[PDB]
Scaffold this active site. Structure first.
Site, PDB file in Angstrom:
ATOM      1  CG  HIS A  43      32.183 123.606   1.422  1.00 36.90           C
ATOM      2  ND1 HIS A  43      32.249 122.916   0.053  1.00 36.90           N
ATOM      3  CD2 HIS A  43      33.385 123.428   1.812  1.00 36.90           C
ATOM      4  CE1 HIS A  43      33.503 122.654  -0.180  1.00 36.90           C
ATOM      5  NE2 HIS A  43      34.155 122.953   0.919  1.00 36.90           N
ATOM      6  CB  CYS A  97      36.135 118.815   1.059  1.00 37.19           C
ATOM      7  SG  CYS A  97      37.402 120.054   1.186  1.00 37.19           S
ATOM      8  CD  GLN A 115      35.201 124.549  -7.499  1.00 36.71           C
ATOM      9  OE1 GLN A 115      34.543 124.409  -6.368  1.00 36.71           O
ATOM     10  NE2 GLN A 115      35.975 123.778  -8.309  1.00 36.71           N
ATOM     11  CB  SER A 138      34.795 120.341  -6.177  1.00 34.63           C
ATOM     12  OG  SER A 138      35.828 121.271  -6.444  1.00 34.63           O
ATOM     13  CG  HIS A 141      30.126 122.529  -2.748  1.00 36.89           C
ATOM     14  ND1 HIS A 141      30.495 122.309  -4.025  1.00 36.89           N
ATOM     15  CD2 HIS A 141      31.613 122.589  -2.443  1.00 36.89           C
ATOM     16  CE1 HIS A 141      31.512 122.347  -4.480  1.00 36.89           C
ATOM     17  NE2 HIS A 141      32.199 122.475  -3.529  1.00 36.89           N
TER      18      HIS A 141
END
Length: 147
Positions: A43, A97, A115, A138, A141
């Site tokens: 991702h 990330c 999540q 976050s 994605h």
């Protein structure tokens, strides 16, 4: 017909029918077609100012709006879908990330670990398929299911 999450809709641009998945935010012209204990996904994450932790290896203070984040995501999906760039190459370069270091691969996981939006999307995407934009705390994605 249609697998989990897949529905038909009308293209306002073209007036042809397309297929969308309300779980993964995938969309495509083509008709798509149990649930395993585990899946594997990579991702690419674009964070924004409203992220849980608005900081990453690329950028200590991320200031872009959630709207700007979404435009970046849309751009990447465009470049992946056109074949101008592949998934792994864009995650490596631009994901907010540290999974970027591993071509965005997060390894195998079951339900109950990630999540929920991310999980639901991952478990609805068949091996080889890619999501649309997926929203968690976050950030935004793109998800590729690899196993």
């Amino acid at each position: 017909k249609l697998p989990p999450g897949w529905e038909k809709a009308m293209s306002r641009s073209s007036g042809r029918v397309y297929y969308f998945n309300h779980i993964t935010n995938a969309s495509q012209w083509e008709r798509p077609s149990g649930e395993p204990a585990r899946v594997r996904c990579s991702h690419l994450l674009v964070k924004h100012s409203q992220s849980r932790r608005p900081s990453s290896w690329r950028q200590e203070k991320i200031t872009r709006t959630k709207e700007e984040a979404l435009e970046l995501i849309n751009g990447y999906i465009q470049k992946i879908k056109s074949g101008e760039e592949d998934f792994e190459s864009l995650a490596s370069q631009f994901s907010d990330c540290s999974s970027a270091k591993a071509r965005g691969d997060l390894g195998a996981f079951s339900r109950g670990q990630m999540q929920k939006p991310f999980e639901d999307a991952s478990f609805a995407l068949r091996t080889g398929e890619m999501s649309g934009p997926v929203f968690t705390d976050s950030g935004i994605h793109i998800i590729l299911r690899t196993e």
